[PDB]
Amino acid sequence: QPDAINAPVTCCYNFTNRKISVQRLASYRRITSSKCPKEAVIFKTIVAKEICADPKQKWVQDSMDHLDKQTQTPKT
Amino acid sequence: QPDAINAPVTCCYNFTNRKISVQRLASYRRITSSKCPKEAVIFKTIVAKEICADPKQKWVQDSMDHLDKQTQTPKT
């Protein structure tokens, strides 16, 4: 049984709905805890402003991917 | 004006109401974001099970203090 229900469930409330420059997006940490009322993207901007963004958007599909492939260093 | 409302607001939902051994409490990160419906203590147990605990309890007043004074190294 889930012996840990008193957990700080990192979630969101709103979602940056403005095409945030992929540049601003210093990183991304897709939230999705089983206790969060909603899934989201933690677009860690450059100033560390973690921005929950609707992953079902068309601008977060391009940015979230740019970060999904930003730390990928192909072994040369 | 708050230009960051699409934020992942680290919050909780329940609170460990059993006197958790201060030993188990590897650390503590008192939550209290202006967007969290409730304040809490992130009692990072030893297994890293962040446990939100009611700071208004009498067992979290002793433990939360033990962690509030666990990383304090008086310069000798």
Swiss-Prot record, chains A, B:
What would changing residue 9 to A do, according to UniProt?
Answer: Slight reduction in activity
According to the record's subunit comment, the protein's assembly and interactions are: Monomer or homodimer; in equilibrium. Is tethered on endothelial cells by glycosaminoglycan (GAG) side chains of proteoglycans. Interacts with TNFAIP6 (via Link domain).
Q: Which domain of life is it from?
A: Eukaryota
According to the UniProt record, what happens if one changes residue 8 to A? Answer: Loss of dimerization; slight reduction of activity
Q: What does the sequence similarity comment in the record state about its family? A: Belongs to the intercrine beta (chemokine CC) family.
**What's the protein called, per UniProt?**
C-C motif chemokine 2
Q: Name one GO molecular function term.
A: CCR chemokine receptor binding
What happens after mutating residue 56 to A? No effect on heparin binding
List the GO biological process terms: angiogenesis; animal organ morphogenesis; antimicrobial humoral immune response mediated by antimicrobial peptide; astrocyte cell migration; cell adhesion; cell surface receptor signaling pathway; cell surface receptor signaling pathway via JAK-STAT; cellular homeostasis
The source organism is Homo sapiens (Human)
Cellular component aspect of the GO annotation:
extracellular region; extracellular space
PTM comment: Processing at the N-terminus can regulate receptor and target cell selectivity. Deletion of the N-terminal residue converts it from an activator of basophil to an eosinophil chemoattractant. N-Glycosylated.
The reply to whether Secreted figures as a keyword in the UniProt entry is yes
- Report the SS bond pairs: 11-36, 12-52
Q: Does the keyword Glycoprotein apply?
A: yes
Q: Which residues make up the annotated site Involved in GAG binding and receptor binding?
A: 24, 49
Q: Which residues carry this modification: Pyrrolidone carboxylic acid?
A: 1
Q: Where is this site: Involved in dimerization, receptor binding and signaling?
A: 13
Give the record's keywords alphabetically: Chemotaxis, Cytokine, Disulfide bond, Glycoprotein, Inflammatory response, Pyrrolidone carboxylic acid, Secreted, Signal
Free-text function comment from the UniProt entry: Acts as a ligand for C-C chemokine receptor CCR2. Signals through binding and activation of CCR2 and induces a strong chemotactic response and mobilization of intracellular calcium ions. Exhibits a chemotactic activity for monocytes and basophils but not neutrophils or eosinophils. May be involved in the recruitment of monocytes into the arterial wall during the disease process of atherosclerosis.
What is expression of this protein induced or repressed by?
A: Up-regulated upon hypertonic conditions. In pancreatic islets, secretion is stimulated by IL1B. Up-regulated by coagulation factor Xa (F10) in PAR-1 (F2R)-dependent manner in cardiac fibroblasts and endothelial cells. Up-regulated by thrombin (F2) in endothelial cells.
Give a brief account of the tissues where this protein occurs.
Expressed in the seminal plasma, endometrial fluid and follicular fluid (at protein level). Expressed in monocytes.
> Hey, where's the site called Involved in GAG binding on this chain?
18-19, 58, 66
| Cellular location(s) | Secreted
What glycosylation sites does the entry record? 14
Record note on what altering residue 27 to Q does: 40% reduction in activity
Q: Consequence of mutating residue 68 to L? A: 90% reduction in activity
Please tell me where this chain falls within the complete protein, as first and last residue plus total length: 24 to 99 of 99
The gene coding this protein: CCL2
